[PDB]
Symmetry: D2
Subunit: 244 residues, 4 copies
């Protein structure tokens, strides 16, 4: 408790799923949170329960003008911005032949370009404060491949890399950038996926808050000497070899 007191955060895709969980988890730790999404109804609903500790803003991560407005909201409403959780994302699938180029561009736009636009938007106020933490949501798909999951895999691997280059550049400014790589988590993005799809050591899928606990750690000053690194939260899947 109070581990994020004094900190202001911006969470992309915070209307439902893990994003919503991160928003609630950080507020519970004393942070003021601005969260954006395209699901206005849902966003305005939780904005009501959170009250003065949060602010919902419509934010299409592929739109730089919208990122700017979301950032202006945080600075003005809460006095500044110290944390960015690039959580917004989508999932599409298809074989090398059946996957539509439009689906490919679309996922590149949201999962990759959107993360980059988030970073470009938050660097000024973060650099002014002298201390910031950027948390990019990748996945274990950003560590290994999956059949018929080319666009998703390509972008999650891309985010993994963007984390490293930006961490290196922003380090001197007092800004840390790390990537989170989870296994299967219970959210609307995977409710159609069997919960034991991956071979985990823990024998179960993850609850969103289990990833939020990691978001809180990386957002806090507790992880002050960690940057440009991959934090895996997958129940052990990537720790072992794929066995039949």
């Amino acid at each position: 408790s109070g581990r994020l007191t004094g900190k202001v955060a911006l969470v992309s895709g915070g209307a439902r799923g893990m994003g919503a969980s991160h928003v609630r988890a950080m507020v519970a730790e004393g942070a003021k949170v601005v969260f954006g999404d395209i699901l206005d109804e849902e966003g305005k609903a939780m904005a009501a329960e959170l009250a003065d500790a949060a602010r919902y803003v419509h934010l299409d991560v592929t739109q730089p003008a919208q990122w700017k407005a979301a950032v202006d909201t945080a600075v003005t409403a809460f006095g500044g911005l110290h944390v960015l959780v690039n959580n917004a994302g989508i999932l599409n699938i298809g074989t090398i032949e059946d996957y539509a180029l439009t689906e490919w561009q679309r996922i590149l736009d949201v999962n990759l370009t959107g993360v980059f636009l988030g970073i470009r938007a938050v660097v000024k106020p973060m650099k002014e404060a002298g201390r910031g933490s950027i948390i990019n949501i990748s996945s274990i798909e950003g560590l290994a491949g999956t059949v018929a999951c080319h666009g998703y895999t390509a972008t999650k691997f891309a985010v993994r890399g963007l984390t490293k280059s930006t961490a290196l550049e922003l380090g001197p400014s007092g800004i840390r950038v790390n990537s989170i790589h989870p296994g299967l988590v219970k959210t609307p993005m995977t409710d159609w996926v069997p919960e034991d799809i991956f071979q985990t050591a823990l024998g179960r899928a993850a609850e969103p808050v289990e990833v939020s606990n990691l978001v809180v750690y990386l957002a806090s000053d507790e992880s002050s000497y960690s940057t440009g690194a991959e934090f895996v939260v997958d129940g052990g899947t990537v720790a072992g070899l794929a066995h039949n």
Copy 2:
């Protein structure tokens, strides 16, 4: 020798630099090679001195229709297509703030989408033959980040990932997919870069043929059990820690 005798390859960005070196190396090994680029003048000159062993085609890797045409050329002129070297690529630099969104889009288009488009085009002929080897040129920049190199890092990491997902999917078809990660190689892309810019164990930059040797190996059947893997040829850079 004839390490590639009987094989047909398609090399993007083969008008100069490493690509050109790959084309010459494979032809020397008995392979028939169709190489494409946007530098037609230089490309045609090469085709001239390579006579029947090769064909130059104009190929902008961001254009799917051009990939289709390149593949048709390889099939009609040589009867098949067994190897693809996704070598075409560009490098642009810039800090998070100064970097142009147009530079970012263009590098994603060339280095990432272009690689995916090549794969899409070569799978029909390869799948019908029941074998093939796709070689994606990533870089050690696809293994770690670099200051003001966000567009390049992100795409090289993405290529690294795409290699894995496509390899898992194409395995059952008898097609292998691997990624090559070279360090500094002497080519026009880096002639403005100091040869000893990386901390290497060998104490020198790479000659383009040294990477071509790796291309020939992955293209030949002597790498029949390797797929979805990263083959590093950087003189030892990523094997060590960045010291001051």
Copy 3:
């Protein structure tokens, strides 16, 4: 505050350096701690200031008999054991030609075998509890190589691997196993090394507590979905490429 309440831990090599920091940090979070070492004077000294929540024990990690005694102490004194921090370790250097084979054997004994012995000694009480967290101290030297640092490098890579095998096996029992990889940290092991020997994004060496924060997080149930994973805390070093 109380993030580790009700948890009993065992820290090897906790008489000074990071080990001591870990003891202090965890006690501050409500944990009862038994810590062993071979520096009895220093061990008894700090055990005096933490007398109510901690217990010192002489423990040579190469001696399984001493590991068992360290465990019985934790179980009888505090009622059980839920956390193990395999922190004890040594550093020796030397070229391939001059490195003494006795030094090589010695470092494998302490740094590697010692880690495995600890795990063997804590699994029973942990399984009996149905919940536990094993934290193995590797290093960035366990992620890449270093000249004249063969024994340390090999052992640190070995810990990284042992972390994974034991994690997969212990997962079904409710026990998580992870490894920490820090960069240069200010401790007596490094008093002789310039604080800026590594190329870091943060431009400074680490403070032992900065690593203890990670130990705290991995010891708590907050990291419940993380097992078999590598947690890097190196100021960004391995995130970039080694430059001259």
Copy 4:
């Protein structure tokens, strides 16, 4: 092909399995080979059918005296030594509790220490010719973990790390050091393991010659710019995520 014509190689554990395969392949590629093992009968037998190009010696990789004897045999009989294939290794298994401490020590001595002893023994003759290729045999178990396979996993990870530390140190002398990581390979070490035990993209286990082709490539000058790197030949296992 005469791909290794003129080079002299020393192979440990070459009396059967992959070791024998490597010997035969290298000799077939025009190389002179000195291969050691503890199975003298089998060693002397295949040395009789290779005669004009190979020399079998008794070599227990745990004894530096025998390593020195093997090395001197290569030099005196073939005039030098340019290639070392650290192939000797053993496999034992057991859960954290049942695993005998004697099995742990034994596999450390043979799998890790033996590899190190091999390197120590060959550097002098390689440093005189300012050229050398050291090929250490790791495994995909040196990349991820396996239940009840702690000694094996640890040592294979250790070999992976030792490869990098030594490569960095030997680079200035023109000596390359790389590690090979194969998946399931049909040899007497795993004739009790179902061939489809691993999730591969290729849908089969490897023939030992498929790994030998990789040893030849690394032994050849065609890999001149690769050192301290990991060469995976596992049919795709590690490129994918463990599924159920």
